Design a protein around this nucleic acid. Structure first.
Length: 71
DNA sequence: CGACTAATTAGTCG
DNA sequence: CGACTAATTAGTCG
């Protein structure tokens, strides 16, 4: 077991096992509390940071619309 | 002290 | 060469 590739793949690497519980909340609520976000990533082999980008990228698109305009 | 948000950044796609 | 998406990352409240 040794590393090979080292690049920031812009597309969260999700797996079927992970998607099973990940999609669960997506079909439940679009807002996760402290005792929610920090729990899903603790239930299995995950990290709170990874579960954050998932939501960030979704809101990032909204920040491009809900802002100030010019001219 | 850590998570959450959001901006910076990085990199492949167009 | 541009653009957009996303990990990176730091600030601030919990």
């Amino acid at each position: 077991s040794a590393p090979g590739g080292k690049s920031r793949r812009r597309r969260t690497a999700f797996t079927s096992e992970q998607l099973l519980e990940l999609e669960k909340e997506f079909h439940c609520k679009k807002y996760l509390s402290l005792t929610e976000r920090s729990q899903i990533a603790h239930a299995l082999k995950l990290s709170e940071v990874q579960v954050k980008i998932w939501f960030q990228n979704r809101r990032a698109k909204w920040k491009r619309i809900k802002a100030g305009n010019v001219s």
